[PDB]
Amino acid sequence: QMDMRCSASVECKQKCLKAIGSIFGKCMNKKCKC
Structure with a gap:
């Protein structure tokens, strides 16, 4: 996992x-954003 x-x-x-x-990132840009 973690891909x-x-x-x-x-x-x-x-x-x-x-x-x-x-x-507390948000699922964005293939990762997460603030």
């Missing part, structure tokens, strides 16, 4: 943490 396809069950943390520094 960087907006459903990796984890991008909603790291991507958001790289975005604004949050662990």
Whole structure:
């Protein structure tokens, strides 16, 4: 699992943490956004 396809069950943390520094990302851009 975890296949960087907006459903990796984890991008909603790291991507958001790289975005604004949050662990509450939203399924977007093959990952998640804040």
